[PDB]
Each structure stands twice: as structure tokens, then as C-alpha cells.
């Protein structure tokens, strides 16, 4: 996340992280959806243009999490997967479409104060929140600038961070970029005349876009941290996985398995 | 620059 | 029923609201 800021304590109880094994380090962000069901972007596993290919032995999900680095021991829960599932129309060769993936733990967590579900959203809510100038809140442990000084700068966060953006019109959307646009997704961030800023960046990906409705006070996962050309680029936005649009799939996969 | 967690996990 | 979810154990639950959440439900009136 660059400018964002230190999340509260609790404030995302439903932020997971990608762990890789060996080497050790952190892959990805994640959403808790069930108490046995992980919500990321599937180009966090699979991507054949850099021959990534992760496997279910390959990674640990560690769930309740604040400090990036420490093992907090008291608090965070971690789960291996017995399956992962990626949209059979997942398309990687040119623009990240359907950039989904669903993972099954291999036993269920406990909740707690510290790991608690989001609500997919339904029709309804899908189309009063999803509007153009609405603000959605993005978390992660990825890279607070998109370069920095070796050694001297900094770098990653030590703690979850947590940004606000606004949603932003099609047709803006559109313009900002040479890569072919699917209606699988949304962008989001600030127009270079708003004098706000904020992005998400590498060790973003996979996490959660989320809006809360002030009717029934639920926070909802609208989108998922998708992809981007750099951080926090003038005239750039940040595209997220139309969570909405792709809820019929993500219904298959739990419903039959 | 990650803390250890236990090895149960890694192996 | 449907399982309890978007409902914070620090935050709505104990009706505590957090540093920024004020910003999104703006949005929403402008
Ligand atoms: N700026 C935001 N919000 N971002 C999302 C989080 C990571 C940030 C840094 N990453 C990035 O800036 C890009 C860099 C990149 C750009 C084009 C192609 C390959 C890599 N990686 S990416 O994951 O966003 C990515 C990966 C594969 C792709 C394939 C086709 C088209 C676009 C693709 C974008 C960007
Ligand atoms: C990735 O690896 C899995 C299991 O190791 C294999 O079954 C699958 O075909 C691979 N997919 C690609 C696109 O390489």
C-alpha cells in the first residue's frame, strides 16, 4: 500500500496472508470468506509466463495477523490447504481476466476477535455500492513505494496498512491504459486533479476491496486487488476483480465441493 | 527478516 | 440462518468506530 496508513488492531479481521514456505516469504494477500474458505486472485498462484505454478504443498495461509514479520503467537492461526481452485476462464496471456482463485484449509479455523469473515455481496448491494466517486478500503503488507533506495529507504510496511479509493467511471478507466478491459472488472484511485493519492502495490495482490453498507453496518468484498501498471502512477489506476460478476463460479465451487 | 514459526509447519 | 459476517468483533460489535471508516460512508452523500 503506498499512502496509506497503520490499520488499528482487529480493523480487518479477515485479512489473510499467502505464506511460501522455502523460500520463506510473503506471496500475496487473501480474504476469509467461511471458516473454511480463502478468497485471492489467481495470479498469485499461476502465472506460466514466469513459470509460477504453486501447489497446495508449496504455501501456508496465516490468518488474524497485524505485524507483518513476527509469529504472533497468541493470535494468528496457521492453516494448510488441502485445495486449490482456479476459474476455468482465467485468462493470463492477455489481460487477467476472471482473476480468481478460491483455496479449502484442511481443517477449519476457530473465529475470534482477531479472524472474522466478509460478506459477499448480493444483487442489491452489488448495484447501490459499485458506483463511480464511492469509497472502498484496501489492505495489505505489500511495498509502500513502487522503487526505493537499496538499504536505506523503506521499503515494506512492519504492519498491516490500509488505504481509502474511490471507485472510478468506465470511460476513465478505459483511457488510462492500453490493456484491453473486460467488464471482470473495476478500476480505482484517485484522478491526477484531486491532490489525494494511493495505490496498492507488489505483495498486494490477492487481498481484498471491500465497502461498508450503511444500512445494515456489514462490510462487503466488492473486488479483489487485481493488477496495475507501477504504484501510485499520475493518471494510473489500480484494477480489481469484479467479486459480483464472478459470484455464480465461486457458488459452483463451494456448492459441489 | 520473518520470526520462525514452528517447524511442524515447514518440514 | 445465514452466517454472521462484515460485523467486526472490535469495531461494530462493541460499537466502536474505526480511525477512517467516517471517509467511505461520506462518499455515499456527496
Ligand atoms: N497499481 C496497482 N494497483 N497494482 C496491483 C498490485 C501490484 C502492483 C505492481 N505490479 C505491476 O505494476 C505489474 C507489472 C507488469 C505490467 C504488465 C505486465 C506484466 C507485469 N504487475 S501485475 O501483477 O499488475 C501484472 C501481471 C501480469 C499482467 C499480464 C497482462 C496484463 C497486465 C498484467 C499485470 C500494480
Ligand atoms: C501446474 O502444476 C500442476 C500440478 O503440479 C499441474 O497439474 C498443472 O498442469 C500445471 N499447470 C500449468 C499451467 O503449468
Known amino acids: 500500500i503506498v499512502e496509506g496508513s497503520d490499520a488499528e488492531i482487529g480493523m480487518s479481521p479477515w485479512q489473510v496472508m499467502l505464506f511460501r514456505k522455502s523460500p520463506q516469504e510473503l506471496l500475496c494477500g487473501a480474504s476469509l470468506i467461511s471458516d473454511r474458505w480463502v478468497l485471492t486472485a489467481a495470479h498469485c498462484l499461476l502465472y506460466p509466463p514466469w513459470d509460477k505454478n504453486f501447489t497446495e504443498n508449496d504455501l501456508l495461509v496465516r490468518i488474524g495477523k497485524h505485524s507483518r514479520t513476527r509469529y504472533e503467537r497468541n493470535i494468528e492461526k496457521i492453516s494448510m ?27 477449519p479455523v476457530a473465529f ?11 444483487r442489491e448491494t452489488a448495484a447501490s455500492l459499485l458506483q463511480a ?43 488510462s491504459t492500453r490493456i484491453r478491459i473486460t467488464d471482470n472488472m473495476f478500476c480505482a484511485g484517485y484522478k491526477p486533479d484531486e491532490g489525494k493519492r494511493g495505490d496498492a502495490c ?39 476483480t469484479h467479486v459480483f460478476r464472478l459470484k455464480k463460479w465461486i457458488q459452483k465451487v463451494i456448492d459441489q465441493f | 527478516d520473518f520470526e520462525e514459526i514452528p517447524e511442524e509447519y515447514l518440514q | 440462518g445465514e452466517a454472521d459476517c462484515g460485523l467486526r468483533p472490535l469495531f461494530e460489535k462493541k460499537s466502536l468506530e474505526d480511525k477512517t471508516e467516517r471517509e467511505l460512508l461520506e462518499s455515499y452523500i456527496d
Not at chain 1, 488441502?82 to 479449502?104: F, G
Not at chain 1, 513505494?145 to 512492519?158: D, Y
Open chain 1, 133 to 175: 466517486g464511492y469509497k472502498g478500503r484496501v489492505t495489505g503488507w505489500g511495498n509502500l513505494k513502487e522503487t526505493w533506495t537499496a538499504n536505506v529507504g523503506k521499503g515494506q510496511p512492519s504492519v498491516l496498512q490500509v488505504v481509502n479509493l474511490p471507485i472510478v467511471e468506465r470511460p476513465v478507466c478505459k483511457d
Open chain 1, 112 to 122: 475470534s476477535d482477531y479472524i472474522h469473515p466478509v460478506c459477499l455481496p448480493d
Open chain 1, 202 to 240: 507488489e505483495g498486494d495482490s490477492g487481498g481484498p476491496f471491500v465497502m461498508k453498507s450503511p444500512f445494515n453496518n456489514r462490510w462487503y468484498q466488492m473486488g479483489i486487488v487485481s493488477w496495475g501498471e507501477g504504484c501510485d502512477r499520475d493518471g494510473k489506476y489500480g484494477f480489481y
Open chain 1, 81 to 107: 490447504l488441502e485445495k486449490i481452485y482456479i476459474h476455468p476462464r482465467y485468462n493470463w496471456r492477455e489481460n487477467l481476466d476472471r482473476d480468481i482463485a478460491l483455496m479449502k484449509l484442511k481443517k
